Amino acid sequence: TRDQNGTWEMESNENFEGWMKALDIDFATRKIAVRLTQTLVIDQDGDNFKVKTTSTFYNYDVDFTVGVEFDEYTKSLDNRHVKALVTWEGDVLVCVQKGEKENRGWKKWIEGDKLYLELTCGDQVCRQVFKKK
């Protein structure tokens, strides 16, 4: 389904360290971040998304409209400028972040009662699975 609305709690996180390292997230931050639990809150109305990711210490918050390119500064993450675009490929939501890093972005989709998130950067892929809270 294309409906990704809800509050989603992480149950699995594969190669998170590899992905953070590919983004050059500093080693000391990685140590704190790597095994934190995550809650992902998605508000979706038509093309309009509001996405909030939360953990004990960190948050990543972003609003976008499907099909509308937006320039991003990746602030507390890796401090880079990218050109972001989120679109649908079937029922997979696909984000491409054009910039220095190759293959940078994510894909998000629903299967059953679960949300799947694939984060990509360089040659690294991180796969996360969430259950609806």
Ligand SMILES: *C/C=C(C)/C=C/C=C(C)/C=C/C1=C(C)CCCC1(C)C
């Ligand atoms: C569509 C879902 C998206 C775009 C989720 C993005 C989530 C992040 C970029 C996660 C960031 C982090 C945390 C939530 C805490 C652990 C360390 C970070 C900064 C990598």
